[PDB]
Design a protein around this ligand. Sequence first.
Ligand SMILES: *[C@@H]1O[C@H](CO)[C@@H](O[C@@H]2O[C@H](CO)[C@@H](O)[C@H](O)[C@H]2NC(C)=O)[C@H](O)[C@H]1NC(C)=O
Ligand SMILES: *[C@@H]1O[C@H](CO)[C@@H](O[C@@H]2O[C@H](CO)[C@@H](O)[C@H](O)[C@H]2NC(C)=O)[C@H](O)[C@H]1NC(C)=O
Ligand SMILES: *[C@@H]1O[C@H](CO)[C@@H](O)[C@H](O)[C@H]1NC(C)=O
Ligand SMILES: *[C@@H]1O[C@H](CO)[C@@H](O)[C@H](O)[C@H]1NC(C)=O
Ligand SMILES: *[C@@H]1O[C@H](CO)[C@@H](O)[C@H](O)[C@H]1NC(C)=O
Ligand SMILES: *[C@@H]1O[C@H](CO)[C@@H](O)[C@H](O)[C@H]1NC(C)=O
Ligand SMILES: *[C@@H]1O[C@H](CO)[C@@H](O)[C@H](O)[C@H]1NC(C)=O
Lengths: 184, 147, 96, 232, 49
Amino acid sequence: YQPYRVVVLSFELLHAPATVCGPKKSTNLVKNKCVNFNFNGLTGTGVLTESNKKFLPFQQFGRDIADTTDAVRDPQTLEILDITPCSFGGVSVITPGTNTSNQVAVLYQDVNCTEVPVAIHADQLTPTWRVYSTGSNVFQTRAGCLIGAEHVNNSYECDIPIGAGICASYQTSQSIIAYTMSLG
Amino acid sequence: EKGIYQTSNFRVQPTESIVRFPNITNLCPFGEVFNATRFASVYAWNRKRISNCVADYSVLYNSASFSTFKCYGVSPTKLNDLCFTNVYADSFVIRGDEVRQIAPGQTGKIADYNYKLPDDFTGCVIAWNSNNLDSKVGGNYNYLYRL
Amino acid sequence: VRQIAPGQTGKIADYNYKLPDDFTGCVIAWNSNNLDSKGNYNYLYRLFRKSNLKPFERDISTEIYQAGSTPCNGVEGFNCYFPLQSYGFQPTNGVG
Amino acid sequence: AYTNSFTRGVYYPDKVFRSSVLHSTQDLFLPFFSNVTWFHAIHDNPVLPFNDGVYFASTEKSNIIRGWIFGTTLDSKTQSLLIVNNATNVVIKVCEFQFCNDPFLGVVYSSANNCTFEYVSFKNLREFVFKNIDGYFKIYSKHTPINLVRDLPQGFSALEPLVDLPIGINITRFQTLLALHRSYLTPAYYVGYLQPRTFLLKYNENGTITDAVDCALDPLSETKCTLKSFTV
Amino acid sequence: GKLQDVVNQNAQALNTLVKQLSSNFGAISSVLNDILSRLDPPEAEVQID
Ligand SMILES: *[C@@H]1O[C@H](CO)[C@@H](O[C@@H]2O[C@H](CO)[C@@H](O)[C@H](O)[C@H]2NC(C)=O)[C@H](O)[C@H]1NC(C)=O
Ligand SMILES: *[C@@H]1O[C@H](CO)[C@@H](O[C@@H]2O[C@H](CO)[C@@H](O)[C@H](O)[C@H]2NC(C)=O)[C@H](O)[C@H]1NC(C)=O
Ligand SMILES: *[C@@H]1O[C@H](CO)[C@@H](O)[C@H](O)[C@H]1NC(C)=O
Ligand SMILES: *[C@@H]1O[C@H](CO)[C@@H](O)[C@H](O)[C@H]1NC(C)=O
Ligand SMILES: *[C@@H]1O[C@H](CO)[C@@H](O)[C@H](O)[C@H]1NC(C)=O
Ligand SMILES: *[C@@H]1O[C@H](CO)[C@@H](O)[C@H](O)[C@H]1NC(C)=O
Ligand SMILES: *[C@@H]1O[C@H](CO)[C@@H](O)[C@H](O)[C@H]1NC(C)=O
C-alpha cells in the first residue's frame, strides 16, 4: 500500500535513419605490426604506419587505381595512416629426387628471412619441421630467402633454378649447395 | 623426381583487434525522466519522445536503485549495440501490488482499462518505491487511479 | 515452435535446445491445450546464460545468475536472478 | 530569364581521397551547357518544384537572400523544413510552420507545432546543391569572388560538402527567403535541376577535382569516356 | 611499339582482375563481413556462394 516509481520504455524501427543507439567503445591504436582493425566501420587486416599524405579535411580514407583501401584517417587524432598487407608468399621444396637422397632445402618467397620462424608457426610445428626455420645455412636472395643450402663461391651449370642468377644442386660428403650460375 | 615444387603458402597472422570510433558527446536526457520534480497519475501518464542522441543503458541497469526490471526481445547486454529511430518513455505513479500486470497478456484494475502492453513487446520496465519522499503525512490525495 | 529450425535465435534456440545448422530429421508439433492446462507451473525454461548452447547439448543447474559486478552467493538480491521461469497455461489464453 | 552554365554544379560525390587519378562516376549532376532560369528581383518569389535535386547560385553583394522553405503541402499538417540565417547562426528547424503565401523576414518570423527537432550551428558568388536521397538531406556549397559583367563565370571549381541531415521528409516543392525593409504582409538567383548523368572527374596530386567531362554531351566526349583519358 | 604492347596488355589484364572484386554478382554486398554481420548463417551461405 505504498507508492511506486515506474518507468517503461519501448522502441520503434519504422524505416528511417536510426537517430538513437548506444555508445560504441574504442581501444588505442598500435602501429608497425599486423592487426585486425575497425576504423569507423571499415574493417581489414594490415600494418599501420605514419604517412605523408594530406587529405582534404572532409575525406575519411583513401584509395588507389584499382580501388583498394590504402590510407585511413583516425577519428580521434585526425592523422593519416598507411595500410600495408601482412606478409605472405609461397613455400617451395628443393629435392634431389627420392631415388638418391632425402635431404631437402626450403625457399620462402619475399620474406627478408628474420620473419621466417614467425611467419610459419615454427613453435607449433613438428621438431623435424623446425630445423628449416633456423640454422647456419640461411641465405637471402632476390628470389626470397633460402634455408638449408650452402652458399659456395664457385660457379657451375644450372641444375635446379631458383631465380635472379642463382641455382642449386646436390654434389658437396654430399650436401645441397647454392651458387651463381656460369655462362661458359 | 628431382626439382623444385611449390607445396604450400604462409601468412603472418594478426595479433590484436583494435577499434577506433569518434568521441561520445551528445548524450540522451535521462535526468529529465529519472530526476524529475513531480510525476503524474496512472491514466494521464506522460510521454517523452527521445531521439537524436546516444543513450547509455548500462548506467540505468547498474543503478542500485530499482526493484523491477524485466523485458522481452532484448537483454540488458544487447542494448548497447542495436539502433532505433525513436525511443519513447513513459512514467507514472502506482501502488505496491499494482505492478505485476504490466506485461503482454494481463488483466487487472488498470491493465486492460488504462495501460496495456500489446501482443508483443520490445522495451523494458524500471520501477522502485516512492514512500521515501512521495507520501506526505496526513494522507495523500494528490494522484488519481481508475476504478 | 518457430525456433526449432536450424539456425534460429531467441530463447528456446539459444538457451534451451540448439539444433545444428546441418540437420537431418523431422520436427513434429501439435496443439496440446487439453492436457497441459488446469495455469500449470511445472513447465520450466531458462532465461539467462553466460553464452549460447552448442548443438545437442543439455544444461541442468539452478546456480543463480549474476549480471552486474556483485558476486552474489545464493542471494536473489539486486541484479542477481534465478534462471528458471515457468509458463502459465489456461483456456483464458488465445492461440499463440 | 535564361542563361547557361558552361561548367557548373560539380561536387565531391563521396569522402574518398584520390590522387592523380581519373575516375568515372554515375550520379545526379547538373548537365553541361544547360538552361537555368534567372530570377532578377527588380520591380519574385514563386514556388518552384524540387524534382530530384536543385542547384542554386546567387550573385549577391549585401546579404538579402537568407534561406529556404521545403516540404510538400505547406499546410502545417505534414512536415516541412526551414533554414534561416539570423546574422550569427544557421538555424535548421523541422516543424509544422505557419506559412504566409508571401513569406519573408524583414530587416522576425517563425513557428512551432507538434514537431521533431532542430539543429543550430560583387565578389560573392555562393553556390549550393540540395539533394534528398534515402532519408538523408545533403547540402554542398562553395563561394568564390567574381567581377564579371553580371552572370555565371566560365571557370571550374568543385563544391565541398557542408552538412548531412537525417530528416526524413517527403520533399516536393521549395521557395527562397529574402530580407526586405517594409513588412508588406499580403494575405539575382538561378535555379537548375539534376539528372542521372555519368561524369569523368580528374583528381590532381592533392585530391582536388580539377576538371570533368560530361560523357553524353557530344560524340567527342564519349570517346574520352570509354578510353578513360582526357586526350585522344 | 611491339615491346610496348606486351607490357600494356599484361597490365590491363591484371587491372581488370582486381577491379572485379568490387562486384556483387547478385549478392547483397561485395564485402564478406557485411554479409556475415548482417545475416544468420543458414542463408548467409547462399549469398557467399
Ligand atoms: C576526442 O577526445 C579526446 C579526449 O579529450 C581529445 O584528445 C585530446 O585533445 C586535446 C586537444 O584539445 C589534446 O591537447 C589532448 O592531448 C588530447 N588527449 C587527451 C587525453 O586529452 C581529442 O582531440 C578528441 N577528438 C576530436 C574532437 O576529434
Ligand atoms: C539522479 O540524480 C542523482 C543525484 O541526486 C544521481 O545520483 C548520482 O549520480 C552520479 C553520476 O555519476 C554518481 O556519481 C553519484 O554517486 C550518484 N549519487 C549521488 C548521491 O550523488 C543519479 O545518477 C541521477 N539519475 C539519473 C540521471 O538517471
Ligand atoms: C633408381 O630407380 C631404378 C628404377 O627401377 C631402380 O632400379 C634403382 O634401384 C634405383 N636406385 C639407384 C640407381 O640407386
Ligand atoms: C631487410 O632487412 C634489412 C636489415 O636491417 C633492412 O635494412 C631492410 O630494409 C629489409 N628489407 C625489407 C623490409 O624489405
Ligand atoms: C666468397 O667471396 C666473398 C667475396 O668477398 C667473401 O666475402 C666470402 O667470404 C666468400 N665465401 C666463402 C669463402 O665461403
Ligand atoms: C535553352 O536556351 C536556348 C537559347 O536561349 C533556347 O534556344 C532553347 O530553346 C532553350 N531550351 C532548351 C530546352 O534547350
Ligand atoms: C598540392 O600540394 C603541394 C604540396 O603540399 C603544394 O605545394 C601545392 O600548392 C598543392 N596544390 C596544387 C599543385 O594545386
